[PDB]
Design a protein around this ligand. Structure first.
Ligand SMILES: COc1cc(CN(Cc2cc(=O)[nH]c(=O)[nH]2)C2CC2)cc2c1OCO2
Length: 164
């Protein structure tokens, strides 16, 4: 069903997260963590305090797809286990902010062709696939986008609900 998912998404905030490669999304899916540049770290920490759920919707650059979505379970923190992010040439790990813990809601992919009818008011009503890393997605567009993903029957939202 979709009812627990709708409950988790109720009054949520949504952010488009771009990854340079599949390797970083794979790491995030395996370890339940994400990290970003300080500009987006500040936005996400503010959002985490502001709303019952903050949803990150992931898209690997040039893949033509979203790779899933996850809920922030923490603000960013430093000093944990280093994550061997495949950083681009020239970016040290020190350029990153802290690490956010996340709980995956859907690890299935969604092609951009399936979201062509959804526009994001916070990015000039451009198709929701279009946006910089960290672009906020307005509630209604973000909710409908998440509802387009194939159901992920491997995940049980019971434990997620208890964290709200
Ligand atoms: C494009 O190369 C980059 C790689 C990273 C490593 N990052 C993936 C990631 C990619 C991204 O685009 N945005 C993110 O927040 N994270 C892992 C820490 C999770 C961070 C970057 C970045 O440029 C903007 O900051």
């Amino acid at each position: 069903g979709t009812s627990k998912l709708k409950y988790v998404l109720q009054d949520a905030r949504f952010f488009l997260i771009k990854s340079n490669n599949h390797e970083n999304v794979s790491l995030a899916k395996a370890k339940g963590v994400w990290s970003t540049l300080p500009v987006n770290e500040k936005k996400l920490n503010l959002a985490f305090r502001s709303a019952r759920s903050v949803i990150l919707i992931f898209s690997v650059r040039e893949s033509g797809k979203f790779q899933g979505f996850a809920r922030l379970s923490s603000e960013s923190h430093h000093g944990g286990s280093p994550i061997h992010w495949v950083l681009p040439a020239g970016m040290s790990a020190k350029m990153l902010g802290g690490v956010f813990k996340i709980d995956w809601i859907c690890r299935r992919e969604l092609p951009f062709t399936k979201s062509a009818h959804l526009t994001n008011p916070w990015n000039e009503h451009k198709p929701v696939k279009i946006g910089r890393d960290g672009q906020e997605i307005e509630l209604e567009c973000g909710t409908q986008l998440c509802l387009l993903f194939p159901p992920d029957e491997s995940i049980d939202l019971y434990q997620v609900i208890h964290k709200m």
